[PDB]
A = this chain, B = another copy of it.
């Protein structure tokens, strides 16, 4: 009955927007304050939102029926008629795209393999580049169930159409804004994350995406509101909620050190009160403990940076 959280340290968790471990925990007041993330969204009562999948293996991946053609001057273009990643049919509904579909922009490198159905399936694999944002003359509609990718080739390849799974390999020109899911038209979206009280900022669970530069790769940060184990926890528990938010403490249980207090709003995002202007990061080896229900206007103890140096100027 009283909501509790799993006693799982952030560095031991699965990321909810890019399929990798959580590596970081931080607030940053210079990032967008009210992100519109479609994955990693659940309410404390267990209501899933946007495209949020249960399984972390589904994050930022897709499945499709793939039909391949050569297109003079581009190389091979695949048309992907999306299905849900469990193989069931995708029908445009009350969310923006198939479960776990990428909810950010840029150019995604995907690895596309024949679906695995039973032992001895012959498997093919092709890397493609797919543009996620609104581009630009057409034509990308994940909400309607259809997307396109290509790989550069001087000539054509052997490629026989079929059911495939696509996993993300790297990102190029990443922008953390939602893609054009519906080709101009309104589409069903989880709402921006918020509101926060004055001085309150979003707690971020962070991991890194391999970001390429043709060559040049480098890590690029991506954040999410809850790691995937907390997503799955709240979806499975379907707790009864009693007031606007939960007061939580983040604590190192080996030392007993209380690191900070934070507010988990019922709508599935955590706030801290911090007035600094730069990124502040926290150790990833504590756990969150539920303290009590609190009103929306409950005022948290502030945190600040542990570096105290200042210049007279």
Query: Using a CB–CB distance below 8 Å, which chain A residues touch chain B?
Result: 6-9, 11-15, 19-21, 23, 53-58, 85-88, 113, 116-125, 207-208, 210, 216-221, 229, 232-233, 235-236, 284
Q: A13, B229: Cβ atoms under 8 Å?
A: no
Give chain B residues whose Cβ lies under 8 Å from the Cβ of A233. Answer: 236
Complex CA distance for A255 and B115, rounded to whole angstroms:
28
Closest Cβ neighbor of A6 among chain B residues: B236
Q: A56, B54: Cβ atoms under 8 Å?
A: no
Q: A87-B11, A218-B122 in contact; A20/B117 too (CB < 8 A)?
A: no
Give me 26 A-to-B residue pairs in the complex whose CB atoms sit less than 8 angstroms apart, sorted by A's number. Answer: A6-B232, A7-B236, A11-B87, A11-B88, A12-B53, A12-B54, A12-B86, A20-B57, A21-B55, A21-B57, A23-B116, A54-B229, A116-B208, A116-B210, A117-B208, A117-B219, A118-B208, A118-B221, A119-B218, A119-B219, A119-B221, A120-B219, A121-B208, A123-B217, A229-B232, A233-B236
Give chain B residues whose Cβ lies under 8 Å from the Cβ of A15. Answer: 57
Q: How far is the CB of A59 from chain B (nearest CB, A)?
A: 10
Complex CA distance for A247 and B61, rounded to whole angstroms:
36
Q: How far is the CB of A282 from chain B (nearest CB, A)?
A: 14
Q: B8, A54: Cβ atoms under 8 Å?
A: yes
Complex CA distance for A220 and B122, rounded to whole angstroms:
10
Give chain B residues whose Cβ lies under 8 Å from the Cβ of A122. Answer: 216-218
Task: Please pick, from B85, B119, B217, the residue contacting A220 in the complex, using a CB distance under 8 A.
Answer: B119
Q: A9-B86, A23-B117, A117-B219 are in contact. List 18 more A-B contacts (CB 8 A).
A: A8-B236, A14-B57, A15-B57, A21-B85, A23-B116, A54-B229, A55-B56, A55-B229, A56-B57, A116-B210, A118-B221, A119-B208, A122-B217, A123-B210, A123-B219, A125-B210, A229-B232, A229-B236
Copies of this chain in the oligomer? 2
Closest Cβ neighbor of A217 among chain B residues: B123
Complex CA distance for A83 and B88, rounded to whole angstroms:
39
Task: Please pick, from B13, B87, B219, the residue contacting A54 in the complex, using a CB distance under 8 A.
Answer: B13
Q: How far is the CB of A207 from chain B (nearest CB, A)?
A: 7
Give chain B residues whose Cβ lies under 8 Å from the Cβ of A113. Answer: 210
Complex CA distance for A44 and B229, rounded to whole angstroms:
18
Complex CA distance for A120 and B216, rounded to whole angstroms:
10
Task: Please pick, from B23, B55, B219, the residue contacting A14 in the complex, using a CB distance under 8 A.
Answer: B55
